[PDB]
Design a protein around this ligand. Sequence first.
Ligand SMILES: Nc1ncnc2c1ncn2[C@@H]1O[C@H](COP(=O)(O)OP(=O)(O)O)[C@@H](O)[C@H]1O
Ligand SMILES: Nc1ncnc2c1ncn2[C@@H]1O[C@H](COP(=O)(O)OP(=O)(O)O)[C@@H](O)[C@H]1O
Lengths: 325, 49, 363, 615, 182, 307
Amino acid sequence: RVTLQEAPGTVPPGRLPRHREVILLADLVDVSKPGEEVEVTGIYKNNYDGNLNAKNGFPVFATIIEANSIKRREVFSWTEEEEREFRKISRDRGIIDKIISSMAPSIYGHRDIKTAVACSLFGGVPKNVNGKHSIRGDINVLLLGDPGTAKSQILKYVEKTAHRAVFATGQGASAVGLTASVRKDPITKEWTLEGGALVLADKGVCLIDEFDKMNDQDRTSIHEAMEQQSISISKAGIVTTLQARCSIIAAANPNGGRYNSTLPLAQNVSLTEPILSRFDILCVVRDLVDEEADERLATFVVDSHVRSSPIPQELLMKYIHYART
Amino acid sequence: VYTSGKGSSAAGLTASVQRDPMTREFYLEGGAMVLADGGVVCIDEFDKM
Amino acid sequence: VSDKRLDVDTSTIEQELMQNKVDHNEVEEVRQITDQDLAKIREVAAREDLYSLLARSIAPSIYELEDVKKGILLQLFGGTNKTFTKGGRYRGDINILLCGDPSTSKSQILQYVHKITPRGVYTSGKGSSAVGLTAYITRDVDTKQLVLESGALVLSDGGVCCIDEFDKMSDSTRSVLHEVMEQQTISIAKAGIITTLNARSSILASANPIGSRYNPNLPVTENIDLPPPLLSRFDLVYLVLDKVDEKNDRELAKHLTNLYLEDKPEHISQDDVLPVEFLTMYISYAKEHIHPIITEAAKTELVRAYVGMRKMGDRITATTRQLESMIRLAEAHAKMKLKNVVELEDVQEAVRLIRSAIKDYAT
Amino acid sequence: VDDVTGEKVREAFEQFLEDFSVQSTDTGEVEKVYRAQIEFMKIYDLNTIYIDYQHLSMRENGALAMAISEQYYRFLPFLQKGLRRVVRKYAPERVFQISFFNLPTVHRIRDIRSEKIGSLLSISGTVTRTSEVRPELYKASFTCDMCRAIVDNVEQSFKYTEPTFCPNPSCENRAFWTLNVTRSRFLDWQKVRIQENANEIPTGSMPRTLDVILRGDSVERAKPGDRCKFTGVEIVVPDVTQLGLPGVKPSSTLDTRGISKTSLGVRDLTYKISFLACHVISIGSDEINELKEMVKDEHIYDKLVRSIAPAVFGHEAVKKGILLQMLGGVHKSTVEGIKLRGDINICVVGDPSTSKSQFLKYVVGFAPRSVYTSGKASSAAGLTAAVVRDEEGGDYTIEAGALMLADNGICCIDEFDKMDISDQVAIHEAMEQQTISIAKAGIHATLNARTSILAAANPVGGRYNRKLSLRGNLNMTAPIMSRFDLFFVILDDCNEKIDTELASHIVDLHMKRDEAIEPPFSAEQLRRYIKYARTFKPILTKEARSYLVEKYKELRKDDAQGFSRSSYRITVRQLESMIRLSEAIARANCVDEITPSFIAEAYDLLRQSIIRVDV
Amino acid sequence: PLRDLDSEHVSKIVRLSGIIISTSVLSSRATYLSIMCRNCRHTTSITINNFNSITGNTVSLPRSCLSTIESESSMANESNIGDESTKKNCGPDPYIIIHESSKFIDQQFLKLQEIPELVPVGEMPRNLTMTCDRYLTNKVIPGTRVTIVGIYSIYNSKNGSGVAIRTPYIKILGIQSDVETS
Amino acid sequence: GDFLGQLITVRGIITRVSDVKPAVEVIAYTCDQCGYEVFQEVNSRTFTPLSECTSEECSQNQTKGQLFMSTRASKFSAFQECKIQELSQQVPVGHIPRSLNIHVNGTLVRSLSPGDIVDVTGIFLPAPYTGFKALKAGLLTETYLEAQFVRQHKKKFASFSLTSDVEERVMELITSGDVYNRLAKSIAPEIYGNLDVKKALLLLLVGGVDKRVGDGMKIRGDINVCLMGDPGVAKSQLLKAICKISPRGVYTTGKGSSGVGLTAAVMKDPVTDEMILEGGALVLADNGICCIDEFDKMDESDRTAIH
Ligand SMILES: Nc1ncnc2c1ncn2[C@@H]1O[C@H](COP(=O)(O)OP(=O)(O)O)[C@@H](O)[C@H]1O
Ligand SMILES: Nc1ncnc2c1ncn2[C@@H]1O[C@H](COP(=O)(O)OP(=O)(O)O)[C@@H](O)[C@H]1O
């Protein structure tokens, strides 16, 4: 049983969406994915009643759209021609800045931080040492931003690129907030062990931004996930150690002005030292008002607003997947 | 038991007591010291607690 | 509904149920003015000393502060109700603070005004909340549904409210009054009802300083913990302090032991005439059948004195609320003594009611 | 007798609408006109009639006017039967609705009593929390299985089940239904719920709800957050929950002084007044030449400046800002993809004792789609849905709420600082996403909102603090400061020309003589001018876009040295804001294909508007 | 894997793997119970063997005093002369369990959930209901990783809907933990 | 549980005394055709109305009448219930005070003021109930205590009239000579010193005199006394003392009561209905003396309550 509402984009002004139920049957189960568009062609019935007794006016019969065919509006892997076609691009020497230049068409410059994004989502060796300890096989990225920088367009592209990635904000909020806890479920009344986003994003890349507006309860969890790659929980009647091997790309925010003084980053930002000890790469965005960036930037701005060498993204998103496998 | 806290992660560090919402009943919740009875507890950041 | 001891309701509020209640015969809702004593009203109106006689006859058990008694008399004659074509909606609200040292019988005034006022509601400080003045949406027991109640200012709608200990509100409370004092509206917007609703009211309040004694050579704005724009928003601000001299206190104790003696209410009969209940029908008759207008001949003196007030610059200041204050207090004085127009004369003491506090601001 | 009464009124009604209906001459509005309504209905096949009351008030000298107006519910089937025989006379499955209109005297909700049952009455109020559209039977095919089950029947009146007499064949009284869910004739109805007008309620109490049912033609015509006029018939609905009120409430113990012997099926009854309506009107050539007089002038920008709020005396930039908010941007889509905003957000920050509330009083007093809120008792939702569950069996009915019904309008909010953080989340989400996400105890949903926000904050210290930066005076969070453009500081000084002009102007305003500071435009024709000015949608075809670019560069050359003023970046969203401000000045001047002089106008407006900020 | 369980797998041997959230309270079913008619004063006994048909039930007490089905003469004589001209009846359901010569067993009702690693990204994780026999009770602390071999079955009872909807559950035979892990 | 039926005597502090509302005893119908008056007795908690007739004339006929009630011919009785808490002096070492209900019928009503020390004597009956349905074993009974005669310690002024026998004790004190300094010696004699403090606190216990001046604004009428100094001047002994001599005297410490503890609060009322304002400390002790310890540690809302 799937309920269905009207599309939020093409609403006439002043009114509201409304709902209507849709019953599925045998073959059409488990095709849709919630929150996305759909296309149905079904018959239109009305359910009968319970028992008709002395109630008030008026007799009212609900309606049911029984479905018969469901389409999308109106899953990536390789075959053999792409593993033999795979090899010809592999032998070139200018593949690297070809990969950098294919990343972000919107941002004109900033080749260094884009290099750090590529090496971030491209991965590394995990790896075990016989027989005690593993070191780390993930690259964590800190990106000291500035209001007036397209860092949300970079990481918002990285949400589009990778295999398994969860964009999880800190506070405000959206599900979930980095902390695994046993809570009920308002659809289905049984208690559920609901893992956090660091639980949810194993062998992937999580996306966290605006560190300066977070609790200590979250900060102990971020410190936990970079410490020994294991979140353990103990409330209420449950005692586990879930495993979590994430890779965090951050997006910071300076204190007040864009770059407060000559003082270094641990003095400039309002964070702490043990969360700065674990982050590997450190990106800084720039700069003060300069001529050629005003020209090449503003011409691209009006070039973008008037409208009323790379590989296209499908071959690279297959490429890094088969590469990381 | 390895707790780097401040309490970690959704588990506190000492013997807290939480009443069961059903039955309105007391039970030992847990922590770090009580689970590790008869051994070694390791702590990071002992000053920053 | 009516009564002969307390005050009588207005008419600019009543006019919807004046428009109704004519098709179907009912009860009176307004005190019936008889004909014989109306001649006595036109006789007492010919008295010269009415301006100190009426203000002397308000609270015959408290004896100082005849400027304050006089301002409390002028709160009962509040302004002229002018309605425009579209918008406007100008009331006759005036608003009085009075502060100063304790043991000054601030409370006796507030209880007496709480008796006289037809629709008065008496709250206090630190017994309030932002919920606590409107929209008590609750569960009535006898019918078991969700019924919405009116709070503490909607019951105050037309008349006099009272607030004690104005220092010790919160930030959330006292942020109600920025709407009631300025816009003359209330805008409820939560889950029950999204609809603005009016609460016209004449707020009276009081506060006790840090001292508690007022000390000289200290700024007047400093000694009461308010932001001085909000202190500047109130119309008439009194500052009642004490005198160390000796000559008044004899008459003070003779008044007290005059009250305690011979176990009978005689309190003031010498050498004074006090109306008992003439003044309530005097005030109501002065509230319906008068519309005072403030035409040309006084604008020279009024604008002249306002620009003279603006001269001080380079503590408290003076804004347009002083000007709105002077016209509404002025025509409120013209509502007294049965005159449909104002005169160039009598505006001077309407300035002097602020100037008495101004002489009380030198120290 | 009584059938002779109702049949007598029936033949007088047939005689009425068959005859003449237009008194006017050749200069009309010619004869008949009712037969043009029947035949004009025959060409399009829509099956209703709209007849007036005033024409029936003309003819009979009020005799038949005082015969339908009282006992209207008694006189449905006679009226509808006679009209059906007129149709079978002049025309070739038919469901007829006879909706009157244009009644003399309008009553409120307070004038509802119970002596006025049955009659017609014009009710005016405010729609809030409409519901959805569901069928209803009123045409039964229900008889017993032994044997015949083909009886078309009753339940036009709400019972619902069942057919009683002449049963079955052959199973007699009281053998009845099984009903039939495929042989009937349905129609659809919803149940909106009116709320009393804000300018009427007796001081001082609270607003009062009422229910109202719409069948047939008037489905979907209502609108959440608009005024209406309805149609009178005013039925009575059976109610339950009024027990232990106290009474004494009646009961219906049936008689037994008939039947002679050789159980206790007694009942209760308690009734509440609902309302039933069928016509919904939503009120609440020559002058296109006057529009030509309002476009051929050149001074129309300065006339629209000098003629907004006559009670305000002083500076003009906030009046220009209000005028620019009342004419929106282009809000067109982009490829593919993310649309462009769109709307403009002027947020007044100022001293108290400034009369900043009078701007909002004029704005919500004038424009359509306006919601005033003095937000401290907002509280939370409030500004969102609720969702309201339940009405009767799975309602999921969504409330208005306060932020959402001001769509394509000016949602004006006071005092950001006195409101808490979840409000600020709802505002920031309502300015970035352009949507609202909701998971409120059950029904998961999403909504939409396209508003303009006008704010009236207060400083931290209440004054200036000229020596501080502007950002130390907001006391609000950072990422909602970035959206607003622009800020409009107000502070006033002492200057005796300004003093005597203000004082003489205020004392003249509190004269009713004179009220004659008369604007060069009248009140309504400006409001008409907005409606024509909305329709343009220009796309600029000017090469001076590069001149706008290096104009933005020379904006960004003086504030680079130094940051001891208001240390902005400057944001590229300023450069996007230049587009939408230039568009709005183009929309006011009745001008397409924007010249660079307009860019100088809005550019200097942002220039001195930041000169008010820097200090 | 737990995500793909069609209705084609009803009543087959299907194993899986998940995480156990929370157990329940030890209950008591019966295996051998001996009865008595309260009117006729008769005695019987009942053995039952397979006891997970949850809202069936597995058996009930019989609904007649059961002595009229007798292959003897004088027993039919006294059961005839319980009254004077009409036959006697213990009925309706007359029997009474004697509690002092019976035997009882155990039943657990666990609850199981898929691993939160894959792939609940959009969704909410889904869950089932277990059931244990005699010796499988009180073996698993809630928290462990497990693999249950079971029989995917169906019961009837109401929700917390229509028409003809039945919820699924798993009978266990039997359980195994991880090795170890603790 | 072996005293059920006897005539016993308890003592304790009354708490939560409810309102007085009428309860029915016999109900009187009229028959309208036969002309009878058919009564009905009601013993239980809930009753049911009845139907056609039960006379000897509307019975044995074909056409039974129909009856409906009336309220000027029934028989009513006042009804009020309260609770006794344990005295907290007669408890074992580690326990908590219990409670026990009381019904009150008839003339004895309006003699149970809250917050007292009382000696109720009555008989001790059962009244049928058990709690949850799954806990019953049959035939559990749930007792109460009927009231018969109420005798208070600390007899309350001014509920007395007689003077003749009283002067046999009062005129001994008057003829004892120097009444005033003797009584000033008598309040809490078990300390030493501070004759002036005892001297003033006798004037606290007397009080008076209120005065209405016909406006009517009211003057007090009462005395308010602070005590200062620390620590060994034995000030708590006087507070327990004078808050034990005066009837209706409540002793509350610093923290202690909340802000809502010594103002009133609103709570739903069991069986008698509904929504009564349950009083706090100050509403309990009016026309009395409210002792207060540790006045500095009070929350500031409580300060404005005292002001
Ligand atoms: N060079 C650029 N090209 C395009 N857009 C830019 C550029 N620099 C900044 N922006 C815009 O400025 C915005 C700055 O966003 P920001 O304020 O960092 O978001 P957040 O709310 O996460 O702080 C970005 O959304 C981006 O669209
Ligand atoms: N004059 C006195 N006579 C008898 N006992 C005294 C005297 N002065 C002090 N005390 C002792 O000092 C103690 C004072 O403690 P108490 O009155 O309980 O509180 P506080 O210490 O606040 O006064 C008493 O317990 C008392 O025994």
